[PDB]
Design a protein around this nucleic acid. Sequence first.
RNA 1: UACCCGCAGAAGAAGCACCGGCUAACUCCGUGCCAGCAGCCGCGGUAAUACGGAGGGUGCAAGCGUUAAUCGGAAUUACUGGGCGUAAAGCGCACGCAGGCGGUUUGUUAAGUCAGAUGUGAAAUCCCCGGGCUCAACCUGGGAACUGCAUCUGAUACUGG
RNA 2: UUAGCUAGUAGGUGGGGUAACGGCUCACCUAGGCGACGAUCCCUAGCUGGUCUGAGAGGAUGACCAGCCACACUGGAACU
Lengths: 155, 129, 205, 123, 82, 80
Amino acid sequence: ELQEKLIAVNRVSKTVKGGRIFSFTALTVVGDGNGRVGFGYGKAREVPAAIQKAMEKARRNMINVALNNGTLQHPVKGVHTGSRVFMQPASEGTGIIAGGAMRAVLEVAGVHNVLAKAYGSTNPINVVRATIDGLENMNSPEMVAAKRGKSVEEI
Amino acid sequence: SMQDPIADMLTRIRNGQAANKAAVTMPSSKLKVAIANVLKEEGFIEDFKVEGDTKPELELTLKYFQGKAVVESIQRVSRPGLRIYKRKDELPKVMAGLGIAVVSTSKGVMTDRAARQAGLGGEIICYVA
Amino acid sequence: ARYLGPKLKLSRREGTDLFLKSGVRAIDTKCKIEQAPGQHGARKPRLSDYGVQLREKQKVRRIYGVLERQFRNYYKEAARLKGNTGENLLALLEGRLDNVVYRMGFGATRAEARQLVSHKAIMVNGRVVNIASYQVSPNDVVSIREKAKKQSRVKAALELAEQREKPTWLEVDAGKMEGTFKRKPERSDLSADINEHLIVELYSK
Amino acid sequence: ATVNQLVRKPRARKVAKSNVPALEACPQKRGVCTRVYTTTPKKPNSALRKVCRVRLTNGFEVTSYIGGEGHNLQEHSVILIRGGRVKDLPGVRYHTVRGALDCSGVKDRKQARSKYGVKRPKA
Amino acid sequence: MVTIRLARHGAKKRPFYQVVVADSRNARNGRFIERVGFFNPIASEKEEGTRLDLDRIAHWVGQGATISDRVAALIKEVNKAA
Amino acid sequence: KIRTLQGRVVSDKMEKSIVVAIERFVKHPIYGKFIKRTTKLHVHDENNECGIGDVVEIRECRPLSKTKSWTLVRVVEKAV
RNA sequence: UACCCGCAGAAGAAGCACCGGCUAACUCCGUGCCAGCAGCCGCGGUAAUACGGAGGGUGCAAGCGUUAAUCGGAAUUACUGGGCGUAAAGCGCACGCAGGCGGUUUGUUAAGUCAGAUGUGAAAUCCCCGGGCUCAACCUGGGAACUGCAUCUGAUACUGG
RNA sequence: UUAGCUAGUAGGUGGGGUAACGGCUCACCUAGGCGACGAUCCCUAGCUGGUCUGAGAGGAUGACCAGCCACACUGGAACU
Ligand SMILES: [Mg+2]
Ligand SMILES: [Mg+2]
Ligand SMILES: [Mg+2]
Ligand SMILES: [Mg+2]
Ligand SMILES: [Mg+2]
Ligand SMILES: [Mg+2]
Ligand SMILES: [Mg+2]
Ligand SMILES: [Mg+2]
Ligand SMILES: [Mg+2]
Ligand SMILES: [Mg+2]
Ligand SMILES: [Mg+2]
Ligand SMILES: [Mg+2]
Ligand SMILES: [Mg+2]
Ligand SMILES: [Mg+2]
Ligand SMILES: [Mg+2]
Ligand SMILES: [Mg+2]
Ligand SMILES: [Mg+2]
Ligand SMILES: [Mg+2]
Ligand SMILES: [Mg+2]
Ligand SMILES: [Mg+2]
Ligand SMILES: [Mg+2]
Ligand SMILES: [Mg+2]
Ligand SMILES: [Mg+2]
């Protein structure tokens, strides 16, 4: 059921008395495929240990996204640090047309029909943070009905 | 200066909502009242009141659902520096229909849906969601 | 304008049987099917996202014997057409005359079926058609013409076709050496190990 | 940024500056070799790079690279020039086309022969 | 003067004529007033081949327009089958 | 069937002629702002009744000089 | 001429770029900061998948590479869609003409704006559904579109008078 | 890193002129006309349907086809 994919692995460096210490970082995403997404970021001296720590962190820290039969409710904007993100609900049989970091988030969240675009910095950690936050603040016709005290005739 | 009283009303609402204020008061005008009407009729505010005769003051009772303000976003579209007018077929829909666009038409101030039904166009005052 | 080199090499690179041989023999008895071609065949390719997308497209192209120009035009058309681009691509390939000749069992391979088409041994609705890429429409009758009915290749191929699963969208009369393309095949009629979304992905970047 | 500011002064589109101006939007240019010599490259490289000073048909006098191992080129050699800088040779912004005009192809090349004007060996 | 004639379109060895009302001085495939029909001499005779808006052709003749020997023959052919 | 234009008298110091400015608001083709645009027209005024500042109604006619192809119809408003 | 029939025999018909990362494809030998490569980062001083040959492989294919050229990616002139404390960017400061913008009420006007009607917006091209060449390219029927302009008649909320 | 330009100039009256309106032309009269909503001067350029790219908005472009213009060795001129 849980769909998990590795987004990026980078080699970072810390300087000590006797030279550089190289460590690895792993950025991952986990999801049910029915509106649940979480990202994880792990650090370790070896690549497998880092990908593992990331997956553990990703399994918890999961959020709920109000999907509309494999697509979004409305066009949405996401922002985190240097990454500005835009997502649009597309028609049936179009697929996910997005970059790697956004595509992984949208795949595991279960968003089968998306037109996406990343502006500014394309740093994977802030791109996935901006995407997740964008999907999170996305509201349902039922939520807007509950707020307005009118329901559910938004037509 | 006080060159845009409409953007001020929206900002008074926006800031009041962010500051968890029960109500917001501002100097009144017919146009501010016409927008206050559309906001109330669409469930974005509780109720509005115009007190005074010589110096009218418009008060709006803000709406809070659960831990949050009802007005998520409220932006000025047409403004003194750049006027935005759209035809019936060019009318914008906020949040793919989940929000409202306040339009000023030949037959008064109404929502995007209302103007579309009435076959009208006009000045796009603001977007509310 | 046709791949003429060793055929089993293509199956070995894709890591699946591409039916480039008749099927008389088990693929493993003719080649090391589980190993890639060349000096570094046993090498495990830690294939990139681009690499998996490319390999899927190559696999599908190698099955039908289509080169890049005609295949990229098949995609352009699959996209232009209404509905699922991935599905439209598979239907366009499946509608090719050389493919239909193979699916009816007149040729042992798509390459044999292609030779039958080119060598003017195939008729569509009583009219001679020698274009491999010819798009066969529903209710069309593809037949081995009278002068080619005697060919031992055709008889041998219909025998091998009996050993393969029967295509639901075709009505073949083995005795007459004629068949009817009843309808376009649905996605559920074609192989599940074809990941056409990777091909749709490859042509959208 | 102001709508009023853009009405007065519209958005100015930057004009693209060419890295091959002596070509003047031509795939190649013909010229005569003025000097045929060697030059040492930039940090961190070291070599005796084969270059030529060429006077082109349009009057431009440029420096061009002579790629491959060995060349027959001397002063008064009529050569064909194409775009392409030599990263560690500042000023070198063009390449001589091997196997065209007075420029011979590279001797005994087997791989990438098209790039060095070498015809298919008889075998 | 104003003439009703054929403009040679189609392709090499497969012509397709366009019946046009035009000032005789313009080029054959050039400036025209009205498209008043078409003529396919390579038509498979199964479904269409020659179509003419005879109501507009007569309007133009009624206003002084001449007709080419080929277009006049096509009017005779359309007034023989239909 | 009477196509007409309206504007204010910019010049009257011309024998049997006047200069009229037709002002309009136009949406900027790029930046969408509504910009003021003026059209100065050399207009025929026989009898010289139109004065500087007067709002006048004008119609298009045949050429009356090298710069005049417009003539006065009525004086809409006069003396500010 | 298209096209159809007959004859003989696999016979007469495969090359080009690439394989260090970006980027699909790895080894040996030669060379030794040389000779040379290089779109960008960068390769070369004895284990060089980066030079040159070879074997193997990858990608295209009657083409393949290279150079030139436009737009894209470039939200990198940002109208849609950017910015100016320390990264490029607030004029050293003020007054102020033109210009831009302008509180609130009523009446009036109807220029902007909005609505409808009518005319026009050539054909071809693009797109859609068809038809014809064995297929395709190509040719072609009908439609859609030409998001525009103009005139006339209305609406009067907002902007202007 | 061009701010002022203009004497047939801008308008009037009458005569002439053209197929036709008109400073088109001439005599006389008035002193206008244009311009920071960019005149004048300088540089470049045939214009369009469209073409290429782009999700669009744009950007770039005006071979082949079709429409309009202009030219016909260079400068001038009329004749039919
Ligand atoms: Mg950046
Ligand atoms: Mg080809
Ligand atoms: Mg690789
Ligand atoms: Mg190389
Ligand atoms: Mg070595
Ligand atoms: Mg380029
Ligand atoms: Mg741009
Ligand atoms: Mg910036
Ligand atoms: Mg400080
Ligand atoms: Mg600074
Ligand atoms: Mg300061
Ligand atoms: Mg009234
Ligand atoms: Mg048209
Ligand atoms: Mg057909
Ligand atoms: Mg057509
Ligand atoms: Mg038509
Ligand atoms: Mg008013
Ligand atoms: Mg006169
Ligand atoms: Mg010129
Ligand atoms: Mg020519
Ligand atoms: Mg032309
Ligand atoms: Mg002429
Ligand atoms: Mg002359």
